[PDB]
C-alpha cells in the first residue's frame, strides 16, 4: 500500500532528523571526534531497494552515536527492513555522520514526494 509505505517513510525520515538534530543542535563535547568517522554512501538512491545501502551502515552509525541510540537504530532497522522488500553499490567518496544523515533524509523526501 503506497499509503502504509509513506507513513513508514515519514517515520524513517523523522527518526533520521531526530539523530541529525541531536548532534547538530546539541552541546555535544564529542562532536569533533564523532565527525572523524567516515560513512559509506550510495552510488545511487532513488528506489526503495536502495535502502539496502542504509541498512548496512546502521551498525557503524550506532557505534558513532555511542561516543557521545540502540532504540533509535533498532527502530530504524525495522522500518528499513519493511521498506526495502539487492546488491548495494557504494560511491567512492565517504561522508561524515552529518553528510550521511543529510543524504538519507533527502532520499526519504524524494520518495515521500512521489507517492503523495
Amino acid at each position, epitope marked *: 500500500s503506497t499509503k502504509k509505505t509513506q507513513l513508514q517513510l515519514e517515520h524513517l525520515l523523522l527518526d533520521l532528523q531526530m539523530i541529525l538534530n541531536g548532534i547538530n543542535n546539541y552541546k555535544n563535547p564529542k562532536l*569533533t571526534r564523532m565527525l*572523524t*568517522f*567516515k560513512f*559509506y554512501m550510495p552510488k545511487k538512491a532513488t528506489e526503495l531497494k536502495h535502502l539496502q545501502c542504509l541498512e548496512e551502515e546502521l*551498525k*557503524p552509525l550506532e*557505534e558513532v552515536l555511542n561516543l557521545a541510540p540502540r532504540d533509535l537504530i533498532s527502530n530504524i532497522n525495522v522500518i528499513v527492513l519493511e521498506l526495502k522488500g539487492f546488491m548495494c553499490e*557504494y*560511491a*567512492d*567518496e*565517504t561522508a*561524515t555522520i552529518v553528510e550521511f544523515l543529510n543524504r538519507w533524509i533527502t532520499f526519504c523526501q524524494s520518495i515521500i514526494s512521489t507517492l503523495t
Partner: single-chain antibody, 219 residues
Framework: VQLQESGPGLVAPSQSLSITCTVSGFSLTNYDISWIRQPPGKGLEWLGVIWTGGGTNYNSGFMSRLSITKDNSKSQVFLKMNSLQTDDTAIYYC????????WGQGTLVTVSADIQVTQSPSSLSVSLGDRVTITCKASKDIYNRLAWYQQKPGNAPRLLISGATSLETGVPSRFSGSGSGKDYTLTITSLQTEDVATYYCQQSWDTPYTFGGGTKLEI
C-alpha cells in the same frame, strides 16, 4: 586520478622534512588525504590524515613533530616533519582515502646519519596451484573498513580488496575477501607466480589507520 609526491631526496637532521603531494583528477574538497611511510626493510605505517573539511589527526607517535596542511585551490597537500632521525628514512606515500583508497607513487626520503591489527601468518612458503588464506584480526569491530594490499619489491602497494569484500577492477578473480566484524580473511586460489609478494591488510575505521604486520608469500 593521480597523486604525486615531491620530496627533498636527502635531508640532514638539522632540517625539516617537507613533502608536497600534488593531486589530479579529483578535488581535495571531496576527500581525506592520509600520509603513509615504509622504512626500507619494513612494513607500512600510517602517519596522519588531513580531513576533507580541514582539521587533522596524527599518529600519537608523531603528533609533536608532524604537520599536515593543504591548499584546496592548488590541489596540494603538504607534510612537514621535524626532529628528524635516521629511522625517518622511508618511502613516503600520500593516499586518497575514499572507499577504495588511491595511492601515490611514493617518494624516498633519506636522512643523513588504538585498534590493533594482527595479521597471520607472517610468512608462507607455498607451491603453484595452492590456495592460501591470510587472516587480519582487529582488536575492535571495524565495520568492514578493511583493505588488502599486494606489494612487490620496488613498487608501491597495489589495492586488491576494499570494504572487506569488494574486488578492485583489474585484480584477478583468484582474490577474494571475507569477514564481518573483527576477523577478516584474504583468500588466493590457484596460486600463480605473479602472486609472489608481501600482503598487508589496513583498517580505516578509526585513527590511527593501522596496518597488519605483513605476510610474505614465496613459492
Amino acid at each position: 586520478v593521480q597523486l604525486q609526491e615531491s620530496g627533498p631526496g636527502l635531508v640532514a637532521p638539522s632540517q625539516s622534512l617537507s613533502i608536497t603531494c600534488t593531486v589530479s583528477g579529483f578535488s581535495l574538497t571531496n576527500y581525506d588525504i592520509s600520509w603513509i611511510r615504509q622504512p626500507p626493510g619494513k612494513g607500512l605505517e600510517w602517519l596522519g590524515v588531513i580531513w576533507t573539511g580541514g582539521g587533522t589527526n596524527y599518529n600519537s607517535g608523531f603528533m609533536s613533530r608532524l604537520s599536515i596542511t593543504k591548499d584546496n585551490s592548488k590541489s596540494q597537500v603538504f607534510l612537514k616533519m621535524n626532529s628528524l632521525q635516521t629511522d625517518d628514512t622511508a618511502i613516503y606515500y600520500c593516499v586518497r582515502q575514499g572507499r577504495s583508497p588511491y595511492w601515490g607513487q611514493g617518494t624516498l626520503v633519506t636522512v643523513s646519519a588504538d585498534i590493533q591489527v594482527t595479521q597471520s601468518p607472517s610468512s608462507l612458503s607455498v607451491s603453484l596451484g595452492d590456495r592460501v588464506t591470510i587472516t587480519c584480526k582487529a582488536s575492535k569491530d571495524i565495520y568492514n573498513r578493511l583493505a588488502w594490499y599486494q606489494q612487490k619489491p620496488g613498487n608501491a602497494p597495489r589495492l586488491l580488496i576494499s570494504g572487506a569484500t569488494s574486488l578492485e577492477t583489474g585484480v584477478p578473480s583468484r582474490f577474494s575477501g571475507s569477514g564481518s566484524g573483527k576477523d577478516y580473511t584474504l583468500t588466493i586460489t590457484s596460486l600463480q607466480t605473479e602472486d609472489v609478494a608481501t600482503y598487508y591488510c589496513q583498517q580505516s575505521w578509526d585513527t590511527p589507520y593501522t596496518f597488519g604486520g605483513g605476510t610474505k608469500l614465496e613459492i
